[PDB]
Amino acid sequence: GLKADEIIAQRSALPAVSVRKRA
Amino acid sequence: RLKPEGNLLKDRYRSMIVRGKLEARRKIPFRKQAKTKLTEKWTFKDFRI
Amino acid sequence: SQPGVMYIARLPHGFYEHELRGYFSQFGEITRLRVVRNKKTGASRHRAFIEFADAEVADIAARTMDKYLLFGHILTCKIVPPAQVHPDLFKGANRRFKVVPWNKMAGRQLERPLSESQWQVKVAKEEQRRAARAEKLKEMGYEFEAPALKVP
Amino acid sequence: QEKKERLLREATAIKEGKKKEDVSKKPYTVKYGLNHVVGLIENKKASLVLIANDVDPIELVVFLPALCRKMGIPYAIIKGKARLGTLVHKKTAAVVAITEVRSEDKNELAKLISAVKEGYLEKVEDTRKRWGGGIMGFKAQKREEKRKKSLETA
Amino acid sequence: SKAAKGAQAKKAAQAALKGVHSHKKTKVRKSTTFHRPKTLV
Amino acid sequence: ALEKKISRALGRGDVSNAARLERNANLPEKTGKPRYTLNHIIRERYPTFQDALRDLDDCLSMLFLFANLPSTTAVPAKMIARCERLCHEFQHYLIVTHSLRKSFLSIKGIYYQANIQGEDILWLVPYKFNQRIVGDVDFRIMGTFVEFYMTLLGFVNYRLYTSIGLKYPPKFDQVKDDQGAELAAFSLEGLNDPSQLFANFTFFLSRETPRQPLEFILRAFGCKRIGWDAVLGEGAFTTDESDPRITHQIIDRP
Amino acid sequence: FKRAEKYVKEYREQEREKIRLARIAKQQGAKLVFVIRIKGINKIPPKPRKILQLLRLRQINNGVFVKVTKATAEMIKIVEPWVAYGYPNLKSVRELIYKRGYGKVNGQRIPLTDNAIIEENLGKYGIICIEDLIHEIFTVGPNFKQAANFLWPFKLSNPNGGFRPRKFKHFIEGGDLGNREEHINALIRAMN
Amino acid sequence: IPVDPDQTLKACKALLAHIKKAAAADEESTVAETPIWLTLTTKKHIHDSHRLQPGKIILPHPLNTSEEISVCLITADPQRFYKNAVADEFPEDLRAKIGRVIDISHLKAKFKAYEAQRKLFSEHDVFLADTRIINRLPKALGKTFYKTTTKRPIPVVLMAQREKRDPLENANARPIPEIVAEIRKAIGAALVHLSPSTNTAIKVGYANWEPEKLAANIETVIRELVERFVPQKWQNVRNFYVKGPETAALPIYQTDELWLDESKVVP
RNA sequence: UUCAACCAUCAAGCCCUGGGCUUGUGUUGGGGACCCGCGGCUGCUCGCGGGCCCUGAAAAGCAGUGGCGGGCGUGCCAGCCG
């Protein structure tokens, strides 16, 4: 991979929040 | 070697004025500007560093 | 009063001595300035040291231009403490750093005609160079009959 | 006009017996609309968030820095909802976001994200916790300075 | 003066961080009466 | 309102929207016509074609004067080229109908008197030189006069060409115009005695001679074969001065 | 105040221009052209600005007639980033000389309102009228240099000045580098 | 040629035996992928400046014939025509060998980053470049590709041999079998690089080949390199060596005169 | 008070009919082992050029050599050569 891709995809450790299951 | 005399623009302009399709006016090279006061913007006043 | 020295890195290509002097002269008059350049080729090493006569003006310049995004570079501007200022930091400052063709020089001495005395010197040192390579290639299992250098 | 041209091309492809995916490529655009951007932040899809500084009512965006901080999204407060509307072909946009870009702009996006991180968030890390306002007027400040000077003299 | 060089550096910082359009023209008013501007009818 | 919309589009960066709104502005710099259409004004001001022919003196003097001027913001270059086009069309009508009667080389210009449908029309044309624009005239209101007289002369030319049964506007060759044909760039096609003084002669105009008045007068008074130097322009009957078919040559050199 | 990005941009532009000029000078290697001075980069290197001084193209929208030789071709190749040049035709030459033609008499700008000025200043060379001047310029005769030196540089107009939302925009945009050939005639029509 | 072939073949056997006995201290994988370098030493600089377009020397035993070698081809605009040509009208071995086709515009767009250039450098072994655009590749690829001469873009000819050309309307390309012949010739040819130096190193083969093949290869590259790419021919030539990446240099030719000409002799 | 794009997306010259050859000069900076070639250095070593890896367009003195012209002998040249 690339360091640019790592920086763009870097997030926090808390999991995602979803309103509903999507397709 | 003919030397043309007169100006045909001025001739047509004088013809218009004499026949009365418009009145004789002079050129205004400068117009009076609106009197204003210059002040600094609030963000530039409150900038701090 | 006390002069102030700022260290600026992450320099983009083109933001060099004259541009630094002209840009930071707007902030304040600059005592000394030096861009760290390689003596090998003359290219910049993307860092420089600027000494203003005023540490407070230097501090303003550092806080203004720190983390500035310029030509894909996030500039690093810091104030070095006077105790950490090296005494030989600005040697060669305020004068241009010239580019020198070392390779062109070396080609010129390779093409320079020399005198016969150092011609026997050079063929002699070639003789023990080839000899030394010969006991190096004894362990090789290799052998070459070396033609002797005829002296001019 | 661009959407109309794309729809005409897709209709031509459908008439010739090809899917619209064969003639149209995957788009990459900025994301706008407050509900959409909040959903993208909650789903951790948005790479960068820009919030207008002058949204009235302020309750629409007052939680957005905290939400971005909790989700680990780079955010920045920028001047001009009209300036964001000029991006999104509207009069006004409250918030915009980037989820992903093209390959030739991935480096530019990462450099912008890093520049935001060390140039906005590190500088406002402390000042975001302070109470604003409290500035006294010109005449009141002059009266207070005169009173303090008189108290110091006497 | 030290205040003068500090003001010059602060002006340079202000120009670097905010730009050069620091001033706005303001109309002078010889009267304290505001009138509704005449518009196209 | 449209200019405000264009300024809004330019300020928001919608360049395509700005161009699409600008093509509705109908600018003189891009069309060569007046910004505002005066067709309803022309009929109101001239109830009769006789009144149009009677104001044609001032109309022709105005347009023949502005055919030789540099470009300004009031009168752009496309507008000046349109004025030249209308003057050339009127000249071709006069040449075909043999309506030109008198001409006069005065110290200020060339007077032409023609007779169209019983009305004598006398107008003045400057010599082809650099005309001086002075500050003693109101050039912008002169430009408004140019717009009005251009709109009038277009309809006058259409009525005259339809009356003599010719296709209006005449075919115009841009390549020959760029090569410098002037009057020779027009090809007049049918729709759907001092007229023959110079009929039997072959004329050659030298380089110093005034090509436009000489060609106009000779071709209106019967000459069918006029040649000239190649720098005077395209459309000559012949170019070589040593052509033995030439009977008369105009020169003015010592 | 001047921006650091402006400083870096100026350095990179001058570096590119230095590379281009050195490449042209190392590589080294008769018609009529019309040359119009346009807007380029702000700082001009000394050799291109000296060539512009010789060609009398200091002001933007100045137009001159140039006879194409080896030397003049080299100088045109040098000053391409600040000029737009092409092949003028007979109508363009005639309209430029008749409508915007001025003469250099004792260092002052005298309009060509008659044949007497041309006969006084160029009559020893056989050019006694404006159409003789046009013939010499168009056919590129023996006296082309003196005819072009007699003609003052043409001051062309800016059509954008006739429209308020785009009044400040320059008419000729930079980027279309190189000869324009016969396409300079559209520029002459729009700016004459 | 002043060089003798029996010495060269003996030197290849000795160097190969050294390579196996050094690797013995996977064994076969260590023996293989080991390049063989021919070293030319001259008396002066072989060329006045750095030339970033390598020269090609045709070899009876081609290099890079292994199927694991990936080839990146750079063409003029557009890349779509050449991608379709590779996908349709190319032989299967070349189709498997060519792993990426990218034109100059997409290269300048997607690979302006130094990390992107290093990734493209690491993702391929042989880079081929159309001669119409090979002058713009030093700026588009940087010092990542041109600090080391191993993976410099090899010049290939894809232009059809006799205004602004529209890439979508026309490609101006030579026929596909000619393109295939040019690509296979450039892949099989050995590469020479000119720098202001007295030393030039050229990869002639691998350790896993046979010394007869190395001897024939080194003989033909010596003769072609001297007759074409060495100014002043053999009296400029000083020494020839054969070496591995970590082995010593085995001489195969020394000279008797160390001077280009007698004018250097000054009394 | 604009951080855009802009080299040759092929030309010219050879062979003289084969589709081949020559020129058109254009590279971010550092770090680590380690095989070499060539010039100085008594020698170590230092230069010039290659070989194998690492890296966000990364960075914390160590600047080293001779001259033409220009500026006021010179820690000055947004001018060159070595």
Residue numbers in the entry:
A (entry chain Ce): 85 to 107
B (entry chain Ce): 395 to 443
C (entry chain CI): 184 to 335
D (entry chain LG): 106 to 259
E (entry chain LX): 12 to 52
F (entry chain CJ): 86 to 277, 362 to 423
G (entry chain CM): 51 to 79, 87 to 249
H (entry chain CB): 16 to 40, 52 to 188, 204 to 308
What's written in the study?
The rixosome defined in Schizosaccharomyces pombe and humans performs diverse roles in pre‐ribosomal RNA processing and gene silencing. Here, we isolate and describe the conserved rixosome from Chaetomium thermophilum, which consists of two sub‐modules, the sphere‐like Rix1‐Ipi3‐Ipi1 and the butterfly‐like Las1‐Grc3 complex, connected by a flexible linker. The Rix1 complex of the rixosome utilizes Sda1 as landing platform on nucleoplasmic pre‐60S particles to wedge between the 5S rRNA tip and L1‐stalk, thereby facilitating the 180° rotation of the immature 5S RNP towards its mature conformation. Upon rixosome positioning, the other sub‐module with Las1 endonuclease and Grc3 polynucleotide‐kinase can reach a strategic position at the pre‐60S foot to cleave and 5′ phosphorylate the nearby ITS2 pre‐rRNA.
(D) Close‐up of the immature H68/H69 area with superimposed transparent model of H68 and H69 of the pre‐5S rotation state (Arx1/Nog2 state).
